[PDB]
């Protein structure tokens, strides 16, 4: 599914991301925009052979199982395919684990490089929430 901007803001709010670990909703929407362009089915293969999945491009080296990332973990205890669903539950629940892991949203390099420190509230401007 490709979400609209406000549609995703609303869904992420329903799923408990607004101010999760202190990160306002616009931070999450901004991250999703630059990770996946709001496409739940986004995948990208990394140089190390791992793959990133879903709206927040969660990586198979640590977080999900895809069966083809040698030496990896599955800390979210999910198949990576779950991260591609139109239902964002798996992506959100895993993101909550990731952002609690120590470096906060810096885990998402696109967030650090494109969202961190910016006027992220613009991502939720004009949305019914
Ligand atoms: Na894995």
Buried/exposed 108-125: b ≥16 CB within 10 Å, e otherwise: bebbeeebbeeebeebbe
The closest of 55, 42, 44 to 111, measured between CA atoms, is 55
Active site includes 7?
Answer: no
E-state strands within 3-92: 43-45, 51-53, 58-59
Contact 72, 118 (CB under 8 A): no
Q: How far apart are CA 64 and CA 56, in angstroms?
A: 13
- The Å distance, Cα 8 to ligand 1 centre, comes to 26
Q: Supply 85's token pair.
A: 């669903």
- From the candidates 7, 35, 66, 119, give the one annotated as an active-site residue: 35
CA–centroid distance, 51 to ligand 1, in Å, is 9
Experimental structure resolution, Å: 1.2
CATH topology of domain 1-129: Lysozyme (1.10.530)
Ordered by start, the domain boundaries in the chain are 1-129
66 a known binding residue? no
Experimental determination approach used: X-ray
Distance (angstroms) between ligand 1 centre and the Cα of 60 equals 4
HEC readout, 84-120: HCCCCHHHHHHHHHHHCCCCHHHHCHHHHHHCCCCCH
Active-site residue, 52 included: yes
């Amino acid at each position: 599914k490709v979400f609209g901007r406000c549609e995703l803001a609303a869904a992420m709010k329903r799923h408990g991301l607004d101010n999760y670990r202190g990160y306002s909703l616009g931070n999450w929407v901004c991250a999703a925009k630059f990770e996946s362009n709001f496409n739940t089915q986004a995948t990208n293969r990394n140089t190390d052979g791992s793959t990133d999945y879903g709206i927040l491009q969660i990586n198979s080296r640590w977080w999900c199982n895809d069966g083809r990332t040698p030496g990896s973990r599955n800390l979210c205890n999910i198949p990576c395919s779950a991260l591609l669903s139109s239902d964002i539950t798996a992506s959100v629940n895993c993101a909550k684990k990731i952002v609690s892991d120590g470096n906060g949203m810096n885990a998402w390099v696109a967030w650090r490089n494109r969202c961190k420190g910016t006027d992220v509230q613009a991502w939720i401007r004009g949305c019914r929430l």
